[model samples]
Target: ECSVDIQGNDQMQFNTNAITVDKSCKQFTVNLSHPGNLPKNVMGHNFVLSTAADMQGVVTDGMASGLDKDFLKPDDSRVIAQTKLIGSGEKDSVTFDVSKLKEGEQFMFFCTFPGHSALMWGTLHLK
Candidate 1:
């Protein structure tokens, strides 16, 4: 059961392109760090999880949800879990049950801060 350290900068990119979650771990945690010196509204970032198939739609709807909701639709079922939006020098984390992952299913992690998804995306592997 290890934790993942993810960084989101002003460049709209994640430091890591992929993440692996161990099946042996009951829960998996992702810690998000924003190292840039911009406010959340201008360069906010958050970590959102969903199936690969639902990525685009989730991001689209999330963008419509606006910054008030951390750029995520309220109670979006497509989102398995997410971290709160953070600004420069801020951080947030979210832990999800590893058992929620289906074997061989494709998953992804991305930032839902408006247009950030175009560049701020990553892969997630279970076991």
Candidate 2:
């Protein structure tokens, strides 16, 4: 499968820290599942993808967007693909065309929820 599944719990941890996707895939999908029981306001998680350089930019800017906005700047060009904010027992997924990724380029994935990415972020490698 050209997809990956990750889990976020109330402890603010992601089950998987590193992900690799084959470029041969026409589209890559990422599923973010929140297994925590806390409300979204207290334990929200969203999957945000961006270049390594812009990862922090997206995260910091997203801080002011709030949960209803999925903690993302409206139509941020810096953003690649992102899953919607989710809470306890909730899930969301995103699929992006492989063409957006470049060979040898650095990519990162993180949770946009304020203060979450610092611990929940990881690298996404193109194979």
TM-score to true structure, per model: 0.96, 0.96
Tens-place lDDT digits, model 2, residues 51-77: 999998898888998878999998999
By summed lDDT, the worst window of 10 consecutive residues in model 2 runs over 98-107
Each candidate's lDDT (Cα)?
0.90, 0.89
For 1-127, candidate 1 gives per-residue lDDT tens digits of: 5689999998988999899998888888999999989899999999998999999999999888888889888988888889999999999999888878887769999999988988999899976
Alpha-carbon deviation at 101 in model 1, angstroms: 0.7
> Among these predicted structures, which one has the highest lDDT?
1
Q: Which residue pairs show collisions in model 2?
A: none
Question: RMSD in angstroms, all models?
Answer: 0.9, 0.8
Clashes of each: 0, 0
